[PDB]
CSV table of C-alpha atoms and ligand atoms in Angstrom, one decimal:
chain,number,residue,atom,x,y,z
A,11,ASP,CA,-17.7,1.7,8.1
A,12,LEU,CA,-15.4,2.3,5.6
A,13,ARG,CA,-17.3,3.0,2.0
A,14,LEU,CA,-16.2,1.8,-1.5
A,15,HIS,CA,-14.5,3.9,-4.2
A,16,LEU,CA,-13.4,2.0,-7.5
A,17,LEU,CA,-10.2,3.5,-9.1
A,18,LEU,CA,-10.8,6.0,-11.5
A,19,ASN,CA,-7.8,4.7,-13.8
A,20,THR,CA,-9.7,1.7,-15.0
A,21,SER,CA,-6.4,0.5,-16.4
A,22,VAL,CA,-5.2,-0.4,-12.8
A,23,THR,CA,-6.7,-3.6,-12.4
A,24,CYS,CA,-7.6,-6.7,-10.4
A,25,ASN,CA,-6.6,-10.7,-12.0
A,26,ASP,CA,-9.8,-10.5,-13.9
A,27,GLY,CA,-9.6,-7.1,-15.7
A,28,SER,CA,-12.3,-5.2,-13.2
A,29,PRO,CA,-11.0,-2.3,-11.5
A,30,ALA,CA,-9.5,-2.3,-8.3
A,31,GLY,CA,-10.5,-0.2,-5.4
A,32,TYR,CA,-10.3,1.2,-1.7
A,33,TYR,CA,-12.3,1.4,0.9
A,34,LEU,CA,-12.0,4.7,2.8
A,35,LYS,CA,-13.0,7.2,5.8
A,36,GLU,CA,-12.1,10.6,6.2
A,37,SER,CA,-11.0,12.2,9.5
A,38,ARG,CA,-11.2,15.5,8.8
A,39,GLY,CA,-9.2,17.0,11.6
A,40,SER,CA,-6.5,14.4,11.6
A,41,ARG,CA,-3.3,14.5,9.2
A,42,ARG,CA,-2.7,10.9,10.1
A,43,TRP,CA,-3.1,8.3,7.2
A,44,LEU,CA,-3.3,4.4,7.5
A,45,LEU,CA,-3.7,2.6,4.5
A,46,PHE,CA,-3.9,-1.5,5.0
A,47,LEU,CA,-3.1,-4.2,2.8
A,48,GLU,CA,-5.4,-7.2,3.0
A,49,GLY,CA,-3.8,-10.9,2.5
A,50,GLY,CA,-4.8,-14.4,1.5
A,51,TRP,CA,-1.9,-16.2,0.0
A,52,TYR,CA,-1.3,-15.8,-4.1
A,53,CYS,CA,-1.5,-18.2,-6.8
A,54,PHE,CA,1.8,-18.8,-9.5
A,55,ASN,CA,0.2,-20.1,-12.9
A,56,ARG,CA,-2.7,-21.1,-15.0
A,57,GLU,CA,-4.0,-23.8,-13.3
A,58,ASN,CA,-3.4,-22.6,-9.9
A,59,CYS,CA,-4.8,-19.3,-10.3
A,60,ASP,CA,-7.9,-21.1,-12.1
A,61,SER,CA,-8.9,-22.8,-8.8
A,62,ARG,CA,-8.7,-19.8,-6.9
A,63,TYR,CA,-11.0,-18.4,-9.1
A,64,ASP,CA,-13.5,-21.2,-8.6
A,65,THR,CA,-13.6,-20.4,-5.0
A,66,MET,CA,-12.0,-17.7,-3.6
A,67,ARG,CA,-13.1,-15.0,-6.6
A,68,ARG,CA,-13.5,-12.0,-4.6
A,69,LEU,CA,-9.5,-12.0,-3.8
A,70,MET,CA,-9.4,-12.1,-7.6
A,71,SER,CA,-12.5,-9.6,-8.8
A,72,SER,CA,-14.2,-6.6,-7.8
A,73,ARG,CA,-17.2,-7.6,-9.2
A,74,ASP,CA,-19.0,-8.9,-5.8
A,75,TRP,CA,-17.6,-6.3,-3.5
A,76,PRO,CA,-19.7,-5.1,-0.8
A,77,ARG,CA,-20.5,-1.2,-0.8
A,78,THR,CA,-19.0,-0.7,2.8
A,79,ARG,CA,-16.5,-2.5,5.3
A,80,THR,CA,-16.7,-2.3,9.0
A,81,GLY,CA,-13.4,-0.8,10.8
A,82,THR,CA,-11.9,-3.1,12.8
A,83,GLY,CA,-9.1,-3.3,15.4
A,84,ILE,CA,-6.3,-0.6,13.9
A,85,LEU,CA,-8.6,0.8,11.4
A,86,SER,CA,-11.2,0.7,13.9
A,87,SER,CA,-12.9,4.5,15.0
A,88,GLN,CA,-13.2,4.1,18.7
A,89,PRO,CA,-10.9,4.7,21.3
A,90,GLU,CA,-12.1,1.5,23.5
A,91,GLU,CA,-11.2,-0.5,20.7
A,92,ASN,CA,-8.1,1.4,19.1
A,93,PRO,CA,-6.3,3.3,21.5
A,94,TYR,CA,-3.4,3.8,18.9
A,95,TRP,CA,-4.9,5.8,16.4
A,96,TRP,CA,-8.7,5.8,16.5
A,97,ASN,CA,-8.8,9.4,15.1
A,98,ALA,CA,-6.8,8.6,11.8
A,99,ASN,CA,-7.9,8.5,8.1
A,100,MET,CA,-8.4,4.9,7.3
A,101,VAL,CA,-8.2,2.9,4.2
A,102,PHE,CA,-8.7,-0.4,3.4
A,103,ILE,CA,-7.0,-2.0,0.4
A,104,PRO,CA,-8.5,-4.9,-1.0
A,105,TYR,CA,-6.1,-8.0,-2.0
A,106,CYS,CA,-7.6,-9.2,-5.7
A,107,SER,CA,-3.7,-9.9,-7.6
A,108,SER,CA,-2.5,-13.0,-5.8
A,109,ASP,CA,0.7,-11.4,-6.2
A,110,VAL,CA,1.8,-10.9,-3.0
A,111,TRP,CA,1.5,-6.8,-3.9
A,112,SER,CA,4.6,-7.6,-6.2
A,113,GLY,CA,3.3,-7.6,-9.7
A,114,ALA,CA,3.4,-5.1,-12.6
A,115,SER,CA,1.7,-6.9,-15.5
A,116,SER,CA,-1.3,-6.2,-17.6
A,117,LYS,CA,-4.2,-8.9,-18.7
A,118,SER,CA,-3.2,-9.0,-22.5
A,119,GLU,CA,-3.6,-11.4,-25.4
A,120,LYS,CA,-0.5,-13.4,-24.0
A,121,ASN,CA,-1.6,-13.0,-20.0
A,122,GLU,CA,-5.2,-14.3,-19.3
A,123,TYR,CA,-4.7,-12.6,-15.8
A,124,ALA,CA,-3.2,-9.5,-14.7
A,125,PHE,CA,-1.1,-9.0,-11.7
A,126,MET,CA,-0.6,-5.1,-10.7
A,127,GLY,CA,-0.5,-5.3,-6.8
A,128,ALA,CA,2.7,-2.8,-6.9
A,129,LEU,CA,0.6,-0.6,-9.0
A,130,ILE,CA,-2.4,-0.7,-7.4
A,131,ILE,CA,-0.7,0.4,-4.1
A,132,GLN,CA,0.7,3.5,-6.2
A,133,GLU,CA,-2.5,4.4,-8.1
A,134,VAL,CA,-4.5,4.1,-4.7
A,135,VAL,CA,-1.9,7.1,-3.5
A,136,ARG,CA,-2.0,8.8,-6.1
A,137,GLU,CA,-6.3,9.4,-6.1
A,138,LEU,CA,-5.7,9.9,-2.2
A,139,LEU,CA,-3.6,12.8,-2.7
A,140,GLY,CA,-6.8,14.8,-3.8
A,141,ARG,CA,-8.9,14.0,-1.1
A,142,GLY,CA,-6.7,15.0,1.7
A,143,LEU,CA,-3.7,12.7,1.8
A,144,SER,CA,-1.9,15.8,0.2
A,145,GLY,CA,-2.1,17.5,3.7
A,146,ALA,CA,-0.6,14.4,6.0
A,147,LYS,CA,1.9,14.7,8.2
A,148,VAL,CA,2.3,10.6,8.3
A,149,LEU,CA,1.4,8.0,5.9
A,150,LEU,CA,1.6,4.5,7.8
A,151,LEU,CA,1.3,1.5,5.3
A,152,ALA,CA,0.3,-1.7,6.8
A,153,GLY,CA,-0.9,-5.0,6.2
A,154,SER,CA,-1.3,-8.4,7.4
A,155,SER,CA,-0.2,-12.2,6.2
A,156,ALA,CA,0.6,-11.7,2.5
A,157,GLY,CA,-0.6,-8.0,3.2
A,158,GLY,CA,2.9,-7.8,6.0
A,159,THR,CA,5.0,-8.9,3.0
A,160,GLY,CA,3.5,-6.4,0.8
A,161,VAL,CA,4.3,-3.9,3.1
A,162,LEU,CA,8.1,-4.7,2.8
A,163,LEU,CA,7.7,-4.9,-1.0
A,164,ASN,CA,6.2,-1.7,-1.2
A,165,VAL,CA,6.9,0.8,1.5
A,166,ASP,CA,9.8,2.3,0.3
A,167,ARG,CA,8.2,2.9,-3.2
A,168,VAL,CA,5.7,4.7,-1.7
A,169,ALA,CA,8.3,7.4,-0.1
A,170,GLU,CA,10.0,7.6,-3.3
A,171,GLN,CA,6.8,8.4,-5.4
A,172,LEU,CA,5.7,11.0,-2.9
A,173,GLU,CA,9.0,12.5,-2.8
A,174,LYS,CA,9.1,12.7,-6.6
A,175,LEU,CA,5.4,14.4,-6.6
A,176,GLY,CA,6.8,17.2,-4.7
A,177,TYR,CA,5.1,15.8,-0.8
A,178,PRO,CA,8.9,15.9,0.8
A,179,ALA,CA,7.1,16.4,4.5
A,180,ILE,CA,4.8,13.7,4.4
A,181,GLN,CA,6.5,10.8,6.7
A,182,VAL,CA,6.4,7.3,5.2
A,183,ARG,CA,6.5,4.0,7.7
A,184,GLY,CA,5.6,0.7,7.8
A,185,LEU,CA,3.4,-2.1,9.7
A,186,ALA,CA,4.0,-5.6,8.3
A,187,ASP,CA,1.9,-8.2,10.6
A,188,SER,CA,2.4,-11.8,9.9
A,189,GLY,CA,4.2,-11.7,7.0
A,190,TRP,CA,7.9,-12.3,8.5
A,191,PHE,CA,8.6,-15.6,7.1
A,192,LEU,CA,11.9,-18.2,7.1
A,193,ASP,CA,13.3,-20.4,4.0
A,194,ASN,CA,13.7,-23.1,6.5
A,195,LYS,CA,14.1,-26.8,6.0
A,196,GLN,CA,10.2,-28.5,6.5
A,197,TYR,CA,9.6,-30.9,8.8
A,198,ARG,CA,8.7,-33.9,6.1
A,209,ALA,CA,8.4,-26.0,-1.6
A,210,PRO,CA,7.6,-22.1,-1.5
A,211,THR,CA,11.2,-21.0,-2.5
A,212,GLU,CA,9.9,-22.2,-6.3
A,213,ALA,CA,6.7,-21.0,-5.9
A,214,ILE,CA,7.8,-17.5,-5.6
A,215,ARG,CA,10.4,-18.0,-7.8
A,216,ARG,CA,8.1,-19.5,-10.4
A,217,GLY,CA,5.2,-16.9,-9.3
A,218,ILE,CA,7.6,-13.7,-9.8
A,219,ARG,CA,8.1,-14.8,-13.4
A,220,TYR,CA,4.5,-15.0,-14.3
A,221,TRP,CA,3.7,-11.8,-12.0
A,222,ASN,CA,6.3,-9.8,-13.8
A,223,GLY,CA,6.9,-9.3,-9.8
A,224,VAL,CA,9.2,-6.5,-8.5
A,225,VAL,CA,10.9,-6.3,-5.3
A,226,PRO,CA,12.9,-3.0,-3.5
A,227,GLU,CA,16.0,-1.6,-5.2
A,228,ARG,CA,18.6,-1.7,-3.1
A,229,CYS,CA,17.7,-5.7,-2.3
A,230,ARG,CA,17.5,-6.5,-5.8
A,231,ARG,CA,20.8,-5.3,-6.6
A,232,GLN,CA,21.9,-7.3,-3.7
A,233,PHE,CA,20.8,-10.6,-5.0
A,234,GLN,CA,20.4,-9.5,-8.6
A,235,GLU,CA,18.9,-11.2,-11.5
A,236,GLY,CA,17.0,-14.7,-10.9
A,237,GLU,CA,17.6,-14.2,-7.2
A,238,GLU,CA,14.9,-11.9,-6.7
A,239,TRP,CA,12.9,-14.5,-4.8
A,240,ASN,CA,15.0,-13.5,-1.4
A,241,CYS,CA,13.3,-10.0,-1.3
A,242,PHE,CA,10.4,-12.0,-0.3
A,243,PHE,CA,11.9,-13.2,3.0
A,244,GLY,CA,11.8,-10.5,5.7
A,245,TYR,CA,15.1,-11.0,7.1
A,246,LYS,CA,16.8,-10.3,4.0
A,247,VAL,CA,14.9,-7.5,2.7
A,248,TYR,CA,14.6,-5.6,5.9
A,249,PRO,CA,18.4,-4.6,6.2
A,250,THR,CA,17.8,-3.2,2.6
A,251,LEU,CA,15.1,-0.8,3.8
A,252,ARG,CA,15.2,2.8,4.1
A,253,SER,CA,11.8,3.7,5.8
A,254,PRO,CA,11.0,2.8,9.6
A,255,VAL,CA,9.2,-0.7,9.8
A,256,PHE,CA,7.6,-1.9,13.0
A,257,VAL,CA,7.4,-5.7,12.3
A,258,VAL,CA,4.7,-7.9,14.3
A,259,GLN,CA,5.4,-11.7,14.4
A,260,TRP,CA,3.8,-14.6,16.0
A,261,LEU,CA,7.0,-16.7,16.9
A,262,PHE,CA,5.0,-20.0,16.1
A,263,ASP,CA,3.1,-18.6,12.9
A,264,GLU,CA,0.4,-20.7,11.6
A,265,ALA,CA,1.1,-20.0,7.6
A,266,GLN,CA,5.0,-20.8,8.4
A,267,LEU,CA,4.0,-24.1,10.0
A,268,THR,CA,1.7,-24.7,7.1
A,269,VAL,CA,4.5,-24.2,4.6
A,270,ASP,CA,7.2,-26.4,7.1
A,271,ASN,CA,4.2,-29.3,6.7
A,272,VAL,CA,4.1,-29.3,10.3
A,273,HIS,CA,0.3,-30.1,11.5
A,279,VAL,CA,4.0,-34.2,20.2
A,280,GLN,CA,7.1,-36.9,20.0
A,281,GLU,CA,11.0,-35.3,20.4
A,282,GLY,CA,11.5,-34.9,17.1
A,283,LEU,CA,8.7,-32.5,16.1
A,284,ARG,CA,9.1,-30.7,19.5
A,285,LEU,CA,12.8,-30.1,18.6
A,286,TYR,CA,11.8,-29.0,15.2
A,287,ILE,CA,9.0,-26.2,16.9
A,288,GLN,CA,11.5,-25.0,19.5
A,289,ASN,CA,14.2,-24.5,16.9
A,290,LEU,CA,11.8,-22.4,14.5
A,291,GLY,CA,10.9,-20.4,17.6
A,292,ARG,CA,14.8,-19.8,18.4
A,293,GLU,CA,15.5,-19.3,14.7
A,294,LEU,CA,12.9,-16.3,14.2
A,295,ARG,CA,14.1,-14.5,17.6
A,296,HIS,CA,17.2,-14.5,16.0
A,297,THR,CA,16.1,-12.7,13.1
A,298,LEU,CA,14.8,-10.2,15.6
A,299,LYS,CA,17.7,-9.3,17.4
A,300,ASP,CA,18.7,-6.2,15.4
A,301,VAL,CA,14.9,-5.2,14.4
A,302,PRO,CA,14.7,-2.2,17.0
A,303,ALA,CA,10.7,-2.0,16.5
A,304,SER,CA,9.3,-5.1,16.8
A,305,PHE,CA,6.4,-7.3,18.7
A,306,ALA,CA,6.8,-10.9,18.7
A,307,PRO,CA,4.6,-12.7,21.3
A,308,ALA,CA,5.3,-16.7,21.7
A,309,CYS,CA,1.9,-17.7,20.3
A,310,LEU,CA,0.3,-20.2,17.5
A,311,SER,CA,-2.0,-17.7,15.4
A,312,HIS,CA,-2.2,-15.8,12.3
A,313,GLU,CA,-2.7,-12.2,12.0
A,314,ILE,CA,-3.6,-9.8,14.6
A,315,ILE,CA,-3.8,-5.5,13.8
A,316,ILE,CA,-7.0,-5.9,12.3
A,317,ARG,CA,-8.8,-8.0,14.8
A,318,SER,CA,-11.4,-6.9,17.3
A,319,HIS,CA,-9.6,-8.2,20.5
A,320,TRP,CA,-6.0,-7.0,19.3
A,321,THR,CA,-5.3,-5.2,22.7
A,322,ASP,CA,-5.3,-8.3,24.6
A,323,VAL,CA,-2.0,-9.7,23.8
A,324,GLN,CA,0.9,-8.7,25.9
A,325,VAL,CA,4.7,-9.5,25.8
A,326,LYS,CA,7.0,-8.2,29.2
A,327,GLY,CA,3.6,-6.5,30.4
A,328,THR,CA,3.4,-4.2,27.2
A,329,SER,CA,0.3,-4.3,24.8
A,330,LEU,CA,0.6,-4.0,20.7
A,331,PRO,CA,-1.3,-0.5,21.0
A,332,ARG,CA,1.1,0.7,23.5
A,333,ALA,CA,4.0,-0.5,21.8
A,334,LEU,CA,3.1,1.3,18.5
A,335,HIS,CA,2.6,4.7,20.2
A,336,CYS,CA,6.0,4.3,21.9
A,337,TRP,CA,7.1,3.7,18.2
A,338,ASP,CA,5.6,7.4,17.4
A,339,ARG,CA,7.4,8.6,20.4
A,340,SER,CA,10.8,7.5,19.4
A,341,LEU,CA,10.2,8.8,16.0
A,353,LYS,CA,11.6,5.8,29.9
A,354,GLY,CA,8.5,3.1,30.7
A,355,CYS,CA,8.1,2.6,26.8
A,356,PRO,CA,9.6,-0.1,25.3
A,357,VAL,CA,9.1,-0.5,21.1
A,358,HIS,CA,11.4,-4.1,21.0
A,359,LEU,CA,9.4,-6.8,22.6
A,360,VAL,CA,10.3,-10.6,21.8
A,361,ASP,CA,9.0,-13.5,24.2
A,362,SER,CA,12.0,-15.5,25.1
A,363,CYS,CA,10.0,-18.4,26.2
A,364,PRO,CA,10.2,-21.6,23.7
A,365,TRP,CA,6.6,-23.1,23.3
A,366,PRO,CA,3.7,-22.2,22.3
A,367,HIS,CA,1.2,-20.2,24.7
A,368,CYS,CA,3.7,-19.8,27.3
A,369,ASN,CA,2.8,-15.9,27.0
A,370,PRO,CA,-0.6,-16.3,29.2
A,371,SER,CA,-2.1,-13.3,26.8
A,372,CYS,CA,-2.2,-15.9,23.3
A,373,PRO,CA,-5.1,-15.6,21.7
A,374,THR,CA,-7.4,-18.2,22.8
B,1,T9W,O1,-2.5,-16.1,4.8
B,1,T9W,C1,-1.5,-15.7,4.1
B,1,T9W,O2,-1.6,-14.1,3.5
B,1,T9W,C2,-0.3,-16.2,4.0
B,1,T9W,O3,0.1,-15.4,2.5
B,1,T9W,C3,1.5,-16.0,2.2
B,1,T9W,C4,2.1,-15.3,1.1
B,1,T9W,C5,3.5,-15.6,1.1
B,1,T9W,C6,4.3,-16.5,1.8
B,1,T9W,N1,5.5,-16.3,1.3
B,1,T9W,C7,6.5,-15.5,1.4
B,1,T9W,O4,6.3,-14.4,1.0
B,1,T9W,C8,7.8,-16.2,0.9
B,1,T9W,C9,7.9,-17.3,1.3
B,1,T9W,C10,6.6,-17.7,1.6
B,1,T9W,O5,5.9,-18.7,1.9
B,1,T9W,C11,3.5,-17.2,3.0
B,1,T9W,C12,2.5,-16.9,3.0
B,2,NAG,C1,-3.2,4.8,-15.2
B,2,NAG,O1,-2.4,3.3,-14.5
B,2,NAG,C2,-1.4,2.9,-15.5
B,2,NAG,C3,-0.7,1.8,-14.5
B,2,NAG,O2,-0.2,2.7,-13.7
B,2,NAG,C4,-0.4,4.1,-16.1
B,2,NAG,O3,0.4,3.5,-16.9
B,2,NAG,C5,-1.3,5.0,-16.3
B,2,NAG,O4,-0.6,6.2,-17.0
B,2,NAG,C6,-2.2,6.0,-15.6
B,2,NAG,N1,-2.9,6.4,-16.5
B,2,NAG,C7,-3.0,8.2,-15.8
B,2,NAG,C8,-4.0,9.0,-17.1
B,2,NAG,O5,-2.8,8.3,-14.9
């Protein structure tokens, strides 16, 4: 179990003004720290956020959070379930800001909701320094789905934070799971919903990316193949070639026209990963992987995801780090989740 701690700085809040927080289990012999960002879509205006508040309240408030969570997958402490970092200090950061971890706006007298995802990450890092993060050698910022996009948006800022707080020896890395999306044509739009949300949230993006696209176009930095080339921290990219959330925003739910659409989507995703040296991209129709119990089951070209992450650690013979399937249809890889 990971144990819940609400933030001591109570000005850093979930959407409804309740304090944000994090679930913690320490490993007191270890200098590795894993900080995982939860996913769960987003909301982009008053009416859309009101609907989320009625049926997805735990993603907008801490008032009903349980006091513990079980660590699973890469947050598991058991070597058989987690061959990669079973001995690490484990942190689960709940997603309660509905802003793809990009917001920096408080609830005030003209804002019904607070959108503080970017400040929540940085406040968690500050408060962990006094619980042993100050002696860390590696901080891996990981995340799934919207949390995976949040890794891309925040990994460099965490490295900047620690560099200016006096900790230049902590190596900050990112692990982005299922957050690598394409702004492609639909089969029958997500791009304003993001452009509209950024305005609603006062959302922020990495600097080098923001300076490339400039004002009014920062929505581009939410797409992995556009923001990743601007990043300075090492980032490992895990991405199903046929991600379920991608097909959803593409209005896909088999005749020739759909067949060609699905094959073209797989080919384009493969192309955007050509120059990403650390990546794992199986030809499956699925969604998320790193915190699920059977995450050691999938293999690409004979190598599992926990092995590929270990090989990434060594890189920073027979221990590859760039694993992208080349077959063009969902589940042509026999190890796909069933
Ligand atoms: O399950 C989940 O959390 C899925 O959430 C998502 C959050 C954001 C996006 N998205 C971007 O980041 C850019 C374009 C786009 O649509 C997609 C899914
Ligand atoms: C609490 O968090 C807010 C928002 O990040 C920040 O402005 C403020 O300085 C913090 N307070 C303390 C005491 O660190």
